[PDB]
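Request: Mind sharing a record?
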Amino acid sequence: SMSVKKPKRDDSKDLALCSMILTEMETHEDAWPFLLPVNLKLVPGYKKVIKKPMDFSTIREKLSSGQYPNLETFALDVRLVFDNCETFNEDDSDIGRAGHNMRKYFEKKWTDTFK
């Protein structure tokens, strides 16, 4: 509350560390469904169904331009990528499997870097 604060957690490396995680996600062999925004002219149903499209290149641009206020807003966008994937793709598909694999990969790196 006013003039009452928990000890200050060092957040000075968070930007660099999120960048490193995102590089590792970009270079994973199962990243290909997520590298670029889904083409809303060429994929029927996407635009109407997925209210907030998100992809790794969009996260990279937001990260590089100071559009994440803290590490939690970064994680929310990464998770959005996988939540959108599950919304639109069957589990038993190459893309559906890719999204589960990448979400697991991400959640481990996240815990190990920050928890």
Observations:
- Residues 1-115 form a domain with the Histone Acetyltransferase; Chain A fold (CATH 1.20.920.10).
- DSSP finds five helices and no strands in the chain.
